Design a protein around this nucleic acid. Structure first.
Ligand SMILES: [Mg+2]
Ligand SMILES: [Mg+2]
Ligand SMILES: [Mg+2]
Lengths: 152, 152
DNA sequence: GCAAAACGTCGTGA
DNA sequence: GACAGTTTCG
DNA sequence: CGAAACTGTCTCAC
DNA sequence: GACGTTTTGC
């Protein structure tokens, strides 16, 4: 369970508030109990010309990877366990995305609980709604209300 | 000169590397001896709904101001003396724009001597070419080559 | 059934 | 993000 | 003459 | 920046 240096976390929190994204999604997928997956992702986006910065994050954070999408690349961290450890430590230094960070930690803690009840799942879905509302969301489709398709 | 907190600088350096900009420009203006102004700017851009963050920077940095340009706003610091003091303390924590910062400090220190030798003005306009080369410059029009119109 | 990965771009917020 | 044009004022 | 603010916008990199 | 839609394999 990796412990991060405060100076690294302070700088990174600023970079994240700038070009990072703390995302929560509800993905329809019929292979799941409630027909949807609760997806969480921490990412940092940067011009591919500066991929080096992202590859560095992979080494420095110790988990995650960099995906390439042409002119732009992204450091991605989705693994729930390392995500919770990392956001717990980064959270206190965030100024713009502190609330979404805490909502993500909140969701992660209730996942085992949500995968047990339709109401618990729907409740967690309302928290992903809150994260989206805090972000500069512009193409969101699946919401907690969409999951209300469980009414069947 | 004001001394800034280390943790403040750590966080800000990260935010600056993400959404800030360290700019150097040669502005055509006939009222100047060499027909051009050497302009230096430190700025942080953010969606206007988050202008509070920029306003807070004015208070924390203690100098500068915030301007509005529609759905986006910017914290600007151009006062040469406070700019030098600020960048001097920020520079050691920058990762993507550390070079740009150091070139600005260099330009600032050579401004008085650049106000004389027309060839010293061109050498400084060189430092400016370097900064623009390091940034994601896409609409630059006035360069040192332009200033080379000092030939009479 | 589910934890992550892998791939696709839209609408800006830089 | 990263400049470029216009105006103000000691 | 010039530092510094007021004002406007290309092309994305987020 | 912040999604969406589909595919992987214990
Ligand atoms: Mg940003
Ligand atoms: Mg950036
Ligand atoms: Mg940005």
């Amino acid at each position: 369970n990796t412990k991060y240096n405060k100076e690294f976390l302070l700088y990174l929190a600023g970079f994240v508030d700038g070009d990072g994204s703390i995302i929560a999604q509800i993905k329809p997928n019929q292979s799941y109990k409630f027909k949807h997956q609760l997806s969480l992702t921490f990412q940092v986006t940067q011009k591919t010309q500066r991929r080096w910065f992202l590859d560095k994050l992979v080494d420095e954070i110790g988990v995650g990877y960099v995906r390439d999408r042409g002119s732009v690349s992204d450091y991605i961290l989705s693994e729930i366990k390392p995500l919770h450890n990392f956001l717990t430590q980064l959270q206190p230094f965030l100024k713009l995305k502190q609330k979404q960070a805490n909502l993500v930690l909140k969701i992660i803690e209730q996942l085992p609980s949500a995968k047990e009840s339709p109401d618990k799942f729907l409740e967690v879905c309302t928290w992903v709604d809150q994260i989206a509302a805090l972000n500069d969301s512009k193409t969101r489709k699946t919401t907690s209300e969409t999951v209300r398709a469980v009414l069947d």
